[PDB]
Each structure stands twice: as C-alpha cells, then as structure tokens.
C-alpha cells in the first residue's frame, strides 16, 4: 500500500513502513543505477547531489503529491544513457531535456528553474517544446533504454488534433482505445475487448492512444511500471481482467499515450498513476508561435465583422459558422500551417495563412450569411470576393458537386481522406445514393450509406464497415449519417472506429473517402453543436444535400432575376 | 471450448427456480451438449463461468491470428443474450405476468433450422421457433421487449 | 410537402385542429424562449412591461397552484390574437392599463370554453395587461424548470 | 542469482523488501509493506515472483527454496 | 471605362445636391451601391504592379479622390465605405509592395491632406508594424523618390521596432545590436540630413536615446566599469556595434583596442572561474568521505558576474598604464592557483579522479593534490618508458 494502514487488522503480522529517503540514500540509488558503467558514473556523480537537492526542494514545494521517486530515477537513467551514447560529459542541453521530460506536467511548479538554480548550466536556456519531448518519448533516439509511458494533459481533448497531424502524419497511425458511445455497449465486455486490443498491440508493436479510459487502469497497473520478466530475449509484462492475471509479450516498438483533461488528472487521477507516467501538457497555444496566435486574434475579429457588418438581428458566430467554438480559429490555423510545412516566415506566408484560414471558415458558413454580408456592405470588394469563393470556387450547391470536386482535386498520397459535413436539410436516402452512383460510375462503386443511430452495438457497425472496406474497389466512398438531437459521443466513437479499421485494412493503396453528415436545426435545442475538430477532418456546410429538382437554379443566378421573370 | 459453444452451445433464459432472487446469474445459463462420436457429458455453465472463459479468451487471443473470429462470435452472442436477460428482468420487476414461466433457448448455431425457441408455458400459446442469424433475431426481440416494457 | 408531418399528425383528427394550432404556436414560441431569443417581436413594447416584486410573488404563488400548460396556452392565444393585430390594438378594450385577469376571463367567456376557477378568484387583479407578456415568459420559465427537474 | 536489469539499483529498499518477502512467503508470515510510490515494492514483488520458480529458478539458492504462485487482488 | 469616371461622380453630386435641397436613406443606399458596382466592374485586377513599384491603373487614386470628396452628409457613410474598399485593395498586396508604391510612385502630389492620404498612411504604418514584428529587414536596398513619405515610413519603422519597455537600457542595447534596420536608419539619417527633417519628433527622441545609450556604453568600455552581460552582448555583435558607432561618430578605432582588451580580460576571468569550478567539483565528489571548508571561494564563485562591473571582477588594461599583470576577484594563493589549473587540465581524466584518498584548503592541497599528482606523473613516466607493472594496468585500466 501507498496509503497508511491500521495495525490491529494486520493480525500482528510484520509491518514495514518506508520513509522518503534523504540526500545520501538518493545519491546511493543513483550510483547503483549508474554502476553498469564506471566512466559515466564518475562523470554524473557531480550532478547527483544537485539533482537530489532539487528533488527534495520540489517535493517540499508542491502542494499535492505530483512528482515522486520514479521521476528522479528516470532522470538519472536518462542522463546516464545520454552520457553513455555521447561518450562525453553531459551537456547542459541534455540535463535540461531530462528535467523537462520528467518534472514537467504542472504549472505551479517551475522544475527547470529549481534545477538550474543549483547549477551554472542555466547558460543554455535553450528550452525544448512539448512537441519535441513527446517525439523523443515516442521515438527516442540492442539496448532497452526504455522511457516511461506518456500522459498528455489537455483542454477540451484538443491534444488529439495535434498528435494525429504532427507525428502520425502518415499511415503509421496508432490505435485509438476509447469508450464506445453506442447505447448498448460500454459495459464490462467493452473493457474486455479493449484490454484484448491493448494486448494485441503490445504483441504486434502498434502504438496506442488511451482516451478517457482511466477506468482501465486496474488492468494496466502492472504494465505501467514497466518491470518485465524475460524469456529467450523477449520481455513479458502482467495484464489482468478480473481475478485472472497473465503474462503478455511486449514488442520493443510499443509505446502508450494517455490523453486526458488536466482537471480530471489534478482532481480524480490517483497519485500512483500520476507517478507511473511521464507527464506533459499540450494545447494549441503550446504549438503556435506568437505571430500565429496574432493570426488567430485577427481571424476572431474578422469573424465578428463577418457576422454583423463590415433591424440587424445581431447574429452570433455559432449561428453563421456551423460548429464554431472558442478554439475554432486556432485549430484552423494549426491545420493550415501544418499543411504548408516548416516554410520560414515571410510576408507571403503570413498572407497565405490568413487567407487559407478565412477560406476554411467560409467553407462552413451559410450562404445566407454571405448574402447578408454583401447586402449590408452594398457590394463591397470583400463581399464579392467571398461570394465568388463560396458559390463558384466551392461546391455548397449539393453533395454530388462536393463529391465530384473532392474526387477530382484531392491529393493522391492520402489514401484515407476524412471529411465532416453539416446540413440543415433531410439526410440522404437510397435515391440520392443512386444519383451519386450515376455521377460516379466509372470512377468508384456505389457509395455506402449508414445511419449511426440504427446501430445498437459497436460490433455491428464494425461488421458493416469491414463489409465495405473489404471490397476490392480501388476507390471507396463511405458515408455516415446522423441527426443531432448524447449524439456527439456516438459520432466520436464511430469516427475513432472508422479510423482504426481503415488503419487496419491498409495493405492496399485503395483511396477511401469518408464523409460524416450531421443534420442540425437553425434554431436548435439548447446543446450547441461543436465542429472544427481539425486534424484529419475537413468541415463543410451544405445547406441542402439534394440537387434541387424543384429548381435547377444555383444561387448567385437568382440574385439578378425578379420573381416576374421566373414566369416568363 | 468456445468453438464448441459456437457450434453446439445453447443459451437459456428462464425465471429463477427454487424461489431464487431475480438476477442475471439465476436467469441465464449455458448448455454445452456432446458431439456425435464423442462421449463427454453435456455440461451446464453459469454466467460466472462464461465470463471467466471470456476473460481467458481475451488474454489468450493476443496472437495476431484469425482466431478472433471465433472469439468475436462468442462475444457477440454472449452480449446479445445478456441484453435479452436484462429485458426479462425489467418486465419481471414491473409486474408483468406473461414472462413468468417464459423459457427461451438461443442456439449459437442452427439446429435443424432453429436459432431461437420460446415457450411461455401456456396452453393457448404454441411453441415459437425461428431460424437465421441469432444476433439479428436477438436484437429485434430485445427491442420489442423494451417497447413492450414502456 | 408531407413526409414527417404525417408522423406527428397520425393520431390527430379534424376536431382537434384548433387545439392543435394553439399548441403548435405556443410550442413554437417556447422554443425561442429556451434559446433566449425574443418570441414576441411583433407585439407592441407597451404590452412588454416588467413585474414588480410583489406582483412577482403573487404570480409565482398563483402559478404554483395552477395548471401551467392550459394557462400558458390560453394567455398565449390571447396575446397573439388580441394584442398583435394593430386592428385590435386600436380596439382599446385591451389597454395596457386594463387588468390581465378581467381581459383573459372576458376572452375565455366569449369563446365559451371551460374557464379555470382559479382565473377569476386566484389571479391577482393588480397585474395589468402591460406586463402580460412578462407573465407568460415567467410562466414558461417555470415550466422549463419543471421540465429540467 | 536473479537476473535483474542493469539500470536497477540494488539499494537498501529493494534489498530489504526482497529479503523480507522471501522469508515471509517461505514461512507463510503475513507481510505488510507501506511506502510512498517508488519504494521498490512492486519491483520486489515481480522479482520474487520470477526468482522463486523453484526448479526453474536461476540460482541454486532459490532452487533449494519453494515454488511460488502469486494471486493478486487490487483493493 | 475608367476614363469616364467623371460622369458617375457628377450624377452622385447631383444626388447630393438634391438631398441637401431636402426614402432618403434608400436613395443613398442605391447610389452607394451603384457606385461600388461601377468601381468593381472597372477595378478588376490588382492594385499594384509586380515589384509594387507602380500602380496598375494610373488613375485609381484620382478616381478615389474624386468620388470620396463628394460632400454627402456625414451620417450616411459615403466616405467611410469607399475608403474601406480602397483599404481592402491595398491590404491584399504584400507589405513591401505597398511601401514601395507608397514612397516611390507619383500619386501623392495632389495634396496629401485628404482622407485617401490618411488611409494609405494608416495602412502603411500597420504594414510596418507587422514587418517589425516579423523582424525582416525593410530598408535593405530600399529606394525612394518622395522624402516626406519615406521619412514617415522610417519613423514608423523606428517607433514600432522599439522595445515595449522603451526605457530598459539593456533591451535598448539588445535591440540596437541585434536588429539590422538600425544600421540602415543610421546610414540614411547620416548621409543626408534632409531625411531627419521629414522624420517625426518621437523618432528623433528614440534616436537620441539610442545615441545616448551607445555613448554611455563606449564610455564604460573605455573606462572599464561595464557589466559582463553588456560586454558579452557587445562582443557577440561587435561588427554591428562598430559599424553603428562609426556612422554616428562620423556624423558627430580606439574602441576596437578597448573591446579587444576587454575580451582578453573576460577570457582570463572565465578561465580562472572554470578552474575554481573544477576544484570545487572535485572536492564535492570526495564530499561523501571528507568535508571541505572554502566558504569565501564558494561565495565568490556563486555570485553571477553579469551584474558585476568588470574592474571589480578583474584588472583591466589601458595605455593609461603599462602592460601590467592581471588580477581577479578570487585572489587565489599560488598553491591553490596551481592546484586549480592542473585539476582543470585533468578535469576529464578518469585516472586522476579516483587516484586519491574537516581539512583546510592548504591541507587539501598537501594531502590530496600532491600525492595524486606525484602518482599521476609516475604513472605517465611508467607508460612513456614502458616499465609499468601489470598490476597497475589491471587496477587502473580495469574500466577502459
């Protein structure tokens, strides 16, 4: 136990209580760790004292037990390995990187300041961003210099957008471990299937992302310690589901990432769990530079102007930009910069980023808002530009036109293309899928249309997804439907399941176009829909998905025609 | 064992005998018959035993092999039957009387064309039997039972 | 133009038509209120007066001892039909200064519908027509709270 | 005798925990270990589980001792 | 066609006269709408040419001035809307293209007191603010024909690039040395005085603050009371520093000698500091077995030099004196100086680290350093000669 006990219940057995070690015990532990080599041990010996004084300082400073001995031991291990590989005295940058990786994760603590206070290494102050640390954890540069598993603390589960974009840019994508949002499947059997998937990923070496599944910790408690038994060179770790405990094989390439909200961790997460994992905080603000954040502010202002003006019901951004929320502009900017690449800052890059962001936001706007902006701007240049882009350079007239444009213009490297669509009209029926087939014939097979609510269990959804993915067609179009009445859990779980299954059926270079269509109401029912999930997804609003048999008119034609002329 | 349960296994849902308190354990039990040419005995398993077998399958099946098909089939049927059991329990708690002598047998694989069999123990209602895939029938039956509960 | 309408109207018959109209209009407005949007833009601001603390306590006590749904439907119908039509605005038998109780009791009598006994006795007369719309708003909020509870 | 990983510290905490665990298990004495996270407790548990495979043990010492099968319950 | 711009303007002015003689808002809206429609149809393509050197349409500014100046009543918002459209057309272009067109081209002579001038100035100031935030050189190879507008642009660059804490001496020096635009600013303002006449008073104030800072820095450098942080920052950017001081002083060599001398004295002080560090670290290593008392040395070493004035930390050399010896803040004894020097040479030696068994610093020298160095020399002579014993190779090089 890590918590205290009552002696009377122990039946007068033997009770041993361990106290927090002093500096000498910590330095002896460090020397024990380094004993495997003598040169490196001598080199780091000087640093051991400062590391121990820093650790006791941190432990007395922090309010709640958040850092512990595992962090200190991991620091010593990482410095030992760095020196061993370098064959030279540990450079300041390495000590800084070790300290940041181990003792980061909290705001109220300034670890690096404490550790630098004891040393003259502060001269470096070349700080390393959480993205670099997370990369080094997942892809840390024969030897099992194994780093701890990652815990990413985020806000509004934003972290998932960043990682998918940055590190998993290609199809090396990890597997998402999450709680299902379908009505009849989240119970014990779901934990059983999840831990089965964790085991299979350990055996195969596929990296895993743990979403809000802290309730699975009792199954993983022993693996997180990463104390392994060995057989024939391979390492094994213990896993449990109930009273059954078994040893399972861990592929060296295996890594674990837990994504969780900062407040859940601070309040609810047990302290030994916080100690077992290497902790980092990730939010869009931690990725964006200053000028990118400035672009975010500019886009928020441009939005506010777009809503009202360059009577006057005083619309809000959510009522115009479907799915808008506090972080929409930041997500858009991140997606833009990530697609552009690492190109250096230039006036061209600044302008192009701003314009791309505006275009993406506009793609989710209602035609009604663009018309309002033009009318109330009396035909301003900006209004006509935006109308041109929306009505002519974009494909909001129907779903068939969007699909044709996406099929023709989309990239050829991205075998899996993900799209999110919002609409106010009626969802697609079989007749609409037939029309789409008639348009697509010669390019892809009949689009497969599924309604997420019709599914009561995740397994039936996976079965149909696999039925579709298993066809030999080089191009596949998958369409999922939902009516937003609660629901967001279903959409998220379906999204994750589809991503995982696409990652699994990947040996072929088939090109899969995935569309998620949500039917909303202009007024609503209180709970505001949230889009702009960014990452792999592209958010497009289509007011009406049908091809308008009642009028073949594409708007911006009627804009210069009277009702009298209609009856000519 | 799981392969045999898929091939021969039969799940049974019935009201608690011996005045036992109503719960999933008392309501649901698994029958595993013997196959032709083999002389082992038809065993009866309790819900705890099926959950133990399931845990074993999950921890064993880490082999990146097609074996998941059988585990997946086993798991699917198990979950469906558990869902059906809770629906019965609900009708029991609400005071319904039809589902007081009602016995249902779900055949993990068709026996002479039968996948589900239901008998209410009444002279007016003859035995009900239907074929096909068990999970579709079970989902439809669960949905009807829930609508009937409301 | 009949796809989802048919599923809502599958049970109603012609005799229900008028009541159905009333229900729909009130439900329509209630939605706007839940979203904090103004449902009564077409109503004269003069009829949009506020309620004093004492009249608020009296109204709350009445509503606690009242059938909230019927009261809301009737008061809504009165507001929409009488106070909205500028023709009935110039018809000054619905002046903001007139007591809400007497106006509503008169209206209900004219359509010879069964009148709620609380209307004549329990309804405070100190509440005038100018605050009538605030009354409906306040009543709807209680319903919405009852619906959350 | 037990083949520990090289980066593991043969410190006093793990030494005493392993010794006490071995003695108490072999003699069936109840042992209660209480310490803040990282005090070589679970590491000692895994090490004693691996070492005490009597005939399959790594050293003549543990080969002379008994064979241990652990059942775990997370309270 | 654009050539006919007078006709729309005349019809709009007629509408103005009719309104002033008196559905008004409706007629205004339709008038503004139709005018915008015409401008859109005519001004179809970019505002500026390739380099941002010239205007696509020679008459754009004339049409904007003509149409904006029509004296509609203010309440209706004619001027604001048209100027918003012009601003939109400007902001679409690259900042450097905007500034190039603004300064070089001949659009302004018509009277820069109008609203179009104030709008274009506003846009150019915002562009300069953005570029300063981007720290990209603007004035590099810049050319100009209108000195007044170039002076406005230059003052905007100076004011926007300046640190937010415009009073921080250290951040002023950092800005001056790091930012390249400052070289160009000083070069231009020195070459032809007329530029400064076109420059604002705020920019001249900032220039005067910068000049004062540089003069104080040079006085400290020559005298020797300069902070080690400032001397480090000056040495890291010695080229820009000497360029700027050459320009200013020619407008208004020994500094190279002084800065070289201070680089040498700083290198000496850092060498001594690192020797003391190595000695302290070795004693800290043998801490677990023996305790050492050198309070004064640890205190002196602990002080951060950046805040300290050089002459207090180390002796500085001047032709105001002869080439006398240097002395430092530490005042190490000869024994400790030799010991720290050798320990610095062998601070990476694994064979010297172990190689030895509260004591005072002279006792530390006597007991630890001398036996150790004696044995180390004897080992080096054994290896050079080859007479080393196998037991020595087994014990010492057990690790290698």
mmCIF file with all atom_site columns, C-alpha atoms in Angstrom, chain A residues 184-185 188-189 192-193 195-197 199-200 203-204 239-242 244-246 454 456 459 463 466, chain B residues 51-52 54-64 68 72-73 75-76 78-79 82-83 135 143 146:
data_model
loop_
_atom_site.group_PDB
_atom_site.id
_atom_site.type_symbol
_atom_site.label_atom_id
_atom_site.label_alt_id
_atom_site.label_comp_id
_atom_site.label_asym_id
_atom_site.label_entity_id
_atom_site.label_seq_id
_atom_site.pdbx_PDB_ins_code
_atom_site.Cartn_x
_atom_site.Cartn_y
_atom_site.Cartn_z
_atom_site.occupancy
_atom_site.B_iso_or_equiv
_atom_site.pdbx_formal_charge
_atom_site.auth_seq_id
_atom_site.auth_comp_id
_atom_site.auth_asym_id
_atom_site.auth_atom_id
_atom_site.pdbx_PDB_model_num
ATOM 1  C CA . UNK A 1 184 ? -25.917 -0.977  -25.580 1.00 0.00 ? 184 UNK A CA 1
ATOM 2  C CA . UNK A 1 185 ? -22.102 -1.286  -25.455 1.00 0.00 ? 185 UNK A CA 1
ATOM 3  C CA . UNK A 1 188 ? -17.602 -4.897  -18.746 1.00 0.00 ? 188 UNK A CA 1
ATOM 4  C CA . UNK A 1 189 ? -17.471 -6.639  -22.126 1.00 0.00 ? 189 UNK A CA 1
ATOM 5  C CA . UNK A 1 192 ? -12.605 -6.986  -22.110 1.00 0.00 ? 192 UNK A CA 1
ATOM 6  C CA . UNK A 1 193 ? -12.387 -6.125  -25.797 1.00 0.00 ? 193 UNK A CA 1
ATOM 7  C CA . UNK A 1 195 ? -7.699  -4.904  -22.998 1.00 0.00 ? 195 UNK A CA 1
ATOM 8  C CA . UNK A 1 196 ? -7.630  -7.565  -25.714 1.00 0.00 ? 196 UNK A CA 1
ATOM 9  C CA . UNK A 1 197 ? -6.732  -4.817  -28.173 1.00 0.00 ? 197 UNK A CA 1
ATOM 10 C CA . UNK A 1 199 ? -2.543  -6.938  -25.606 1.00 0.00 ? 199 UNK A CA 1
ATOM 11 C CA . UNK A 1 200 ? -2.608  -7.385  -29.368 1.00 0.00 ? 200 UNK A CA 1
ATOM 12 C CA . UNK A 1 203 ? 2.453   -8.199  -29.163 1.00 0.00 ? 203 UNK A CA 1
ATOM 13 C CA . UNK A 1 204 ? 2.489   -6.550  -32.589 1.00 0.00 ? 204 UNK A CA 1
ATOM 14 C CA . UNK A 1 239 ? -2.133  -7.954  -17.501 1.00 0.00 ? 239 UNK A CA 1
ATOM 15 C CA . UNK A 1 240 ? -5.361  -8.710  -15.694 1.00 0.00 ? 240 UNK A CA 1
ATOM 16 C CA . UNK A 1 241 ? -9.086  -8.830  -16.354 1.00 0.00 ? 241 UNK A CA 1
ATOM 17 C CA . UNK A 1 242 ? -10.731 -9.587  -13.031 1.00 0.00 ? 242 UNK A CA 1
ATOM 18 C CA . UNK A 1 244 ? -7.157  -13.665 -13.942 1.00 0.00 ? 244 UNK A CA 1
ATOM 19 C CA . UNK A 1 245 ? -3.583  -12.425 -14.325 1.00 0.00 ? 245 UNK A CA 1
ATOM 20 C CA . UNK A 1 246 ? -1.435  -13.450 -17.288 1.00 0.00 ? 246 UNK A CA 1
ATOM 21 C CA . UNK A 1 454 ? -29.611 2.373   -36.464 1.00 0.00 ? 454 UNK A CA 1
ATOM 22 C CA . UNK A 1 456 ? -27.115 -0.537  -31.175 1.00 0.00 ? 456 UNK A CA 1
ATOM 23 C CA . UNK A 1 459 ? -19.575 -4.657  -33.317 1.00 0.00 ? 459 UNK A CA 1
ATOM 24 C CA . UNK A 1 463 ? -19.032 -5.536  -39.248 1.00 0.00 ? 463 UNK A CA 1
ATOM 25 C CA . UNK A 1 466 ? -15.497 -4.200  -42.764 1.00 0.00 ? 466 UNK A CA 1
ATOM 26 C CA . UNK B 2 51  ? -17.329 -14.539 -18.093 1.00 0.00 ? 51  UNK B CA 1
ATOM 27 C CA . UNK B 2 52  ? -14.266 -16.467 -16.933 1.00 0.00 ? 52  UNK B CA 1
ATOM 28 C CA . UNK B 2 54  ? -14.343 -14.729 -21.943 1.00 0.00 ? 54  UNK B CA 1
ATOM 29 C CA . UNK B 2 55  ? -11.554 -13.221 -19.855 1.00 0.00 ? 55  UNK B CA 1
ATOM 30 C CA . UNK B 2 56  ? -9.399  -16.205 -20.750 1.00 0.00 ? 56  UNK B CA 1
ATOM 31 C CA . UNK B 2 57  ? -10.134 -15.774 -24.448 1.00 0.00 ? 57  UNK B CA 1
ATOM 32 C CA . UNK B 2 58  ? -9.239  -12.087 -24.356 1.00 0.00 ? 58  UNK B CA 1
ATOM 33 C CA . UNK B 2 59  ? -5.923  -12.611 -22.593 1.00 0.00 ? 59  UNK B CA 1
ATOM 34 C CA . UNK B 2 60  ? -5.096  -15.620 -24.788 1.00 0.00 ? 60  UNK B CA 1
ATOM 35 C CA . UNK B 2 61  ? -6.099  -14.207 -28.179 1.00 0.00 ? 61  UNK B CA 1
ATOM 36 C CA . UNK B 2 62  ? -3.251  -11.682 -28.342 1.00 0.00 ? 62  UNK B CA 1
ATOM 37 C CA . UNK B 2 63  ? -1.970  -13.926 -31.124 1.00 0.00 ? 63  UNK B CA 1
ATOM 38 C CA . UNK B 2 64  ? -2.386  -11.730 -34.186 1.00 0.00 ? 64  UNK B CA 1
ATOM 39 C CA . UNK B 2 68  ? -10.517 -13.566 -33.206 1.00 0.00 ? 68  UNK B CA 1
ATOM 40 C CA . UNK B 2 72  ? -15.699 -12.366 -31.767 1.00 0.00 ? 72  UNK B CA 1
ATOM 41 C CA . UNK B 2 73  ? -18.601 -14.651 -32.494 1.00 0.00 ? 73  UNK B CA 1
ATOM 42 C CA . UNK B 2 75  ? -18.502 -12.397 -27.532 1.00 0.00 ? 75  UNK B CA 1
ATOM 43 C CA . UNK B 2 76  ? -21.255 -11.146 -29.776 1.00 0.00 ? 76  UNK B CA 1
ATOM 44 C CA . UNK B 2 78  ? -22.818 -13.572 -25.186 1.00 0.00 ? 78  UNK B CA 1
ATOM 45 C CA . UNK B 2 79  ? -23.560 -9.878  -25.185 1.00 0.00 ? 79  UNK B CA 1
ATOM 46 C CA . UNK B 2 82  ? -27.082 -10.712 -21.630 1.00 0.00 ? 82  UNK B CA 1
ATOM 47 C CA . UNK B 2 83  ? -29.096 -7.901  -23.143 1.00 0.00 ? 83  UNK B CA 1
ATOM 48 C CA . UNK B 2 135 ? -27.830 -11.809 -33.173 1.00 0.00 ? 135 UNK B CA 1
ATOM 49 C CA . UNK B 2 143 ? -36.233 -4.052  -28.999 1.00 0.00 ? 143 UNK B CA 1
ATOM 50 C CA . UNK B 2 146 ? -38.260 -2.807  -24.411 1.00 0.00 ? 146 UNK B CA 1
#
